Amino acid sequence: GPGSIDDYSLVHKNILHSEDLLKYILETSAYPREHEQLKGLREVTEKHEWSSALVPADEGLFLSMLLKLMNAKRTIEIGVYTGYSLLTTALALPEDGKITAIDVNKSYYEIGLPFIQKAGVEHKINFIESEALPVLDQMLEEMKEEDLYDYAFVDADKSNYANYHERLVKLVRIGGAILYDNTLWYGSVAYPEYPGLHPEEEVARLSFRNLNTFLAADPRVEISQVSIGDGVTICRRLY
């Protein structure tokens, strides 16, 4: 995966019933409200080999709306890539907000870093080039309740979401939000079997079918799976 695209199958599949409907949403409601630096970051990223992993613009405004409605101040971003969702979070947070951004590939982050800097929000970002799980485990033993996160966006290795979940249910405050990206996996999760996939795509597809069942039965959180982008599952920590 990101971190070749020639071998993947689902990258061009929609979950909406037509390209024209998605194009309407983006042109009517998303692009007119997209920050100029988000537009620049998106446009260079669409030329990249792994542009299919890019968080779409309509989902980005949805993430920003969640952040502002819940008055988020300290967040964690797992899976940065070129930094579209990271820049979305940094622009939504107040001037003194803080983000812990984790990704195994900092070179991806440096593609979007000039746009993050021009938006004047780089100071809010503490980027850590590493695999997410050791970072989350290190946090679990250093984290005190005063520094729990308000918000967590999970968008890294798809087969590792369940492992991320067991850490984040303790790293996010009570009432905070944990968001999992791609939980519908281009709609491929709607069937027990789905032919024609790359082996990595099938691993992710099975991982999401298991995760969606688990999150629906997890009493520690309340959930809401949203049919936006590639599917986003919002979980709110109950206790």
Ligand X SMILES: Nc1ncnc2c1ncn2[C@@H]1O[C@H](CSCC[C@H](N)C(=O)O)[C@@H](O)[C@H]1O
Residue positions forming the annotated binding site: 55, 77, 79-80, 85, 103, 132, 155, 157, 181-182
Give residue number: closest CB to ligand X: 3
Hey, which residues between 101 and 160 contact ligand H6N (CB under 6 A)? 155
Q: For the window 178-217, what string marks contact with a second copy as x by the rule CB under 8 A?
A: ------x--x-xxx--------------------xx-xxx
Handedness of CA 12, 15, 20, 26 (dihedral sign): negative
Distance CA 90, CA 179 (A): 16
Hey, which residues between 16 and 75 contact ligand H6N (CB under 6 A)? 52-53
Handedness of CA 15, 18, 22, 28 (dihedral sign): negative
Size of the site for a second copy (CB under 8 A): 49
Q: Site residues (CB under 5 A) for Mg ion?
A: 155, 181-182
Name the residue nearer to ligand X (CB basis): 117 or 191: 117
3-state secondary structure of 82: coil
Q: Site residues (CB under 6 A) for ligand X?
A: 2-3, 53-55, 79-81, 84-85, 102-105, 108, 131-132, 155-157
Tell the smallest beta-carbon distance from residue 210 to ligand X (Å).
18
Q: Does 162 bind a second copy (CB under 8 A)?
A: no
Distance CA 238, CA 15 (A): 30
Name the residue nearer to ligand H6N (CB basis): 150 or 201: 201
Name the residue nearer to ligand X (CB basis): 81 or 185: 81
Distance CA 173, CA 110 (A): 30
Inter-residue contact 106 to 80 (CB < 8 Å): no
Q: Does 169 bind a second copy (CB under 8 A)?
A: no
182 binds, among ligand X, a second copy, ligand H6N, none (CB under 5 to 8 A by kind): ligand H6N
User: In the numeric block, which tokens belong to residue 85?
Assistant: 């969702």
3-state secondary structure of 53: helix
Tell the smallest beta-carbon distance from residue 69 to ligand X (Å).
20
How distant, in Å, are the alpha carbons of 41, 94, 182 from that of 36?
A: 9, 18, 25
* Residues in Cβ contact with 77 at an 8 Å cutoff, skipping those fewer than 6 apart: 85, 86, 89, 99, 100, 101, 102, 152, 153, 155
Please give the residue ranges that form the binding site for ligand H6N (CB under 6 A).
1-2, 52-53, 155, 181-182, 230
